[model samples]
Target: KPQIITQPETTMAMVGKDIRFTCSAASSSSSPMTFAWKKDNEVLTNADMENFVHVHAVMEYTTILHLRQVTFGHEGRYQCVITNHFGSTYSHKARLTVNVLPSFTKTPHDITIRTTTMARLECAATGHPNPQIAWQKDGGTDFPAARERRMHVMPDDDVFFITDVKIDDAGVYSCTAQNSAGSISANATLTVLETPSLVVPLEDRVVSVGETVALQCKATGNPPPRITWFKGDRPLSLTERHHLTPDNQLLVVQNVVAEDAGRYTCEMSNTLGTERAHSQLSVLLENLY
Candidate 1:
């Protein structure tokens, strides 16, 4: 009787490519052998499935089934059959799958959102063999939202979400789709708009008459907040006794007097919104007896 020694294995190939399936058999008696190939349980008769047969020994026979320029029609379960004067033997069936590279169906677009709000980004892809989709932030896998447990991804829905937007979350986001055939990626920028804010609170100053006093307005915001100085309700008047820094972030009082002892305000403004910080200055007379 003839017994299969080697069976064909499963394979995945792209369209327009070639593939081969091999089967080997051995028999106890030195008898002539015939080889046949079947696809989906049906005998294969096309010339494209060219058979090459070789004999390793007097009882050993090997047959190779070659598929040239394979297409979707050629994708199916394949098996090989061998027969001799004594008996016939069949090899295990294997599957042939055709695959295509991954491609984007819908790519995410650039978005500008306010801080602390929910942000949604969407992307989708299509390909043979079902491509896998994933995301990246600024060309890397590290995400501030992911670290803070505020990021959500839905593979089936083709959506990515950030529950609470932060300034750190502003950057280029990448969507990648991959498959056995190939990989592709797309990018989108996330701009987070923030209102003007102060990094630190202003402190009241207590200095003697004729002493110099400097107050700093530490402001922060996206697009950079512009600083302005105001005395009570009126803008601070520039004079030889009072000066402001080039960036208007600092206000220096050259000679403190009773007139300079009042409420001072630092106004921080930006395109998004404005913020104000207030402080008081108290002047004292020198004690001389």
Candidate 2:
């Protein structure tokens, strides 16, 4: 029977490092034996084995195996097998585990998305143990989210996508790759380019004589929207009874009267396009004050 005198032991290695060990055996009977090695039931070929792996020993009792430029794929259970006419025996299995830190192959980048469209942000990395990916939004307290809550990670395990993006999606977005070894992250900017449109349209306003009335309207766009008030197709005079705050975001009608009633429209526009909304103003009959 063949007995193992010195056998490899379990050890820890990192990516790109070398793994070297030796195995020694002896037999009670003076019989010739052949030695071979296997990893996880797979046979090793001589390719890249010249310098990477070689058996070195003064006596056949012990042999050495060397591996250069180690990687995750190089780790596995290793066993030494000795066979001869006397009998066959195997060495205790030696396990090899590797540690890999988070590494970024590609980092996230800034992008401008169109409203009501899909957008994608991508990143890549390599590690011994696969890493988890996450995303963050601007104000930096971001999320693994997308516009319209349509965010999705790609099958490649590295890309994040959002369908039907919106203006609120605009901001700095971050991508994070994490593992037990460590964590790494990247950033991306999203500017949603959109045409001016009414998010809050004007509603019909009712007011009584001698009462002050405010007609309200609001809009959203990339370049910011300009508010213009008109009465039944005619532009309103700011200096007249009609009043607009310094920023022109609102319209205030002072001393409401019967003449103050009309089809009022709030017009918004920008370099993109124009949008208009109409609301009727009804002045109540005079009060018995």
Candidate 3:
């Protein structure tokens, strides 16, 4: 029977620190015995420890393990096993615990989100004991319930996402990663955007001369798209016969003439982009009855 004379002691280390552990055992049997080191239940080889570990044995009875630049990845349970021709046995298990401080790996990215779209603010970090992530708005806003419902942090605390972004949502945001060891923070910016588009398509108009008619062109955008009316290559501004609706969405031509019967185009624009559509207006002479 092989008996253990010494077993590795519980080891505690901080990240980036070095540690050493040793074990010794003896077998009174006549047959030579073999010794091996293991973590959990898996056998460890020189390849696995080449960079961070050093092992040594003497007379198949003693074993030693050393780790350099220790990290959170090195924490685990370790044990030593010895086997002779007759049988094999294990020694007591030793646990290695490494403590680490939370550190942010990447800063959150600045982003622009189009209205009725989604945006994800990213903040990545790493730590030994894991950490909790929290977000704060720059304007001291109590994060809205609507946004909270669409956000999820646990299990994957790397991103804070909001769907259907609003004007109020545009601003700087900060994220904090914290654990018992320490904490870290980072900031990200969010900008709301929208593209020019027509709220409703304008329909062709047919009216008699000496009569009133209106060409309707309504558009919507983040900044309320601006409307411009054009007849062929000509730019139609204010005129006695052509009047734009007070809101500027419609082209009203009072007492229209044959010249008013032509292709009328409405161009919508905003800070993002522009959209244009054309509608035809046909004016006929009234019978002088």
Candidate 4:
């Protein structure tokens, strides 16, 4: 009497490698049959039966138990006992599962824009069974396939909107996650700006510079709008005949001497709007002699 068979009821290993457990024997004995190995309940001597081996015996009676370098406490439940003399048979329980893969606990969030205006790109990831998101644009070019209503993809799903954002949307933005086994990715970087708007007489203007001439004012917003120059409302200080253009534009009398004439105003603010422009510096002193 002899009976025992094992063929993959569950198995997965990754820690040290090497795991093979197969035992077979239906009948055909005349003695010579005594192989027992139990783990989890102890009882596995002879140095674990010299790693247990009995490969094949004559016709269709096999036995293979090679488990070397396989750690993690050798995993559980392993019993393959077969005795001859008409008594004893057991096999149908082989399970060894061990796996560990998932990283990047948390680190993804940083998107800023300015240039043309409008920008939104977010990335969130958490492992253990919830990860499957995709979006890419690292160096440049590749963020123009969302032009329906000005770009919108936010329902608490992760946000990715770009209504009026420009400057190539800045750079770096890749968020990916895949499951079924393992996958993770995260990166963010978007900064495009051009602040300080007032652009010449786009709203109102008048100019006349001669004496030593040097009076100009311009503005465009995005983080560069902060120019101030006034004469009627006061607040005009830039000696040597006045000069201001760190984005405030106003360089009076650089050549238009005669104290620059008078009646010149140029103010610009950012964050949205607040503008002003007026020019009327009539300098009449034509003496070609």
lDDT winner, 2 or 4? 2
Alpha carbon deviation, residue 226, candidate 1 (Å)? 3.1
Candidates by TM-score, descending order: 1, 3, 2, 4
Candidate 4 clash figure, as a count: 27
Looking at model 1, which ten-residue stretch has the lowest summed lDDT? 47-56
Report residue 36 deviation for candidate 2 (angstroms).
Answer: 14
* Candidate 3 lDDT, 90-130, residue by residue in tens: 88899999878888876778887788787776777788687
In candidate 4, what are the lDDT values of residues 181-240, reduced to their tens digit?
467777777667665555556333233344355567767666667777776678775676
- The true-structure Cα RMSD of candidate 4 reads 12.6
> All predictions: root-mean-square deviation over Cα?
4.3, 7.8, 12.2, 12.6
Clashes of each: 0, 3, 0, 27
Lowest summed lDDT across 10 adjacent residues in model 2 is found at 47-56
Per-residue alpha-carbon lDDT of model 2 for 65-154, expressed as tens digits?
A: 677878878889988777778888888888988879888888878877778888878788778588877677864544434434688777
Q: Estimate the lDDT of model 1.
A: 0.86
**Shift of residue 49 alpha carbon in model 1, Å:** 2.7
lDDT of 2: 0.76
Where model 3 places Cα greater than 4 Å from the true spot, the runs are 1-101, 139-148, 152-157, 163-168, 181-183, 245-247, 287-289
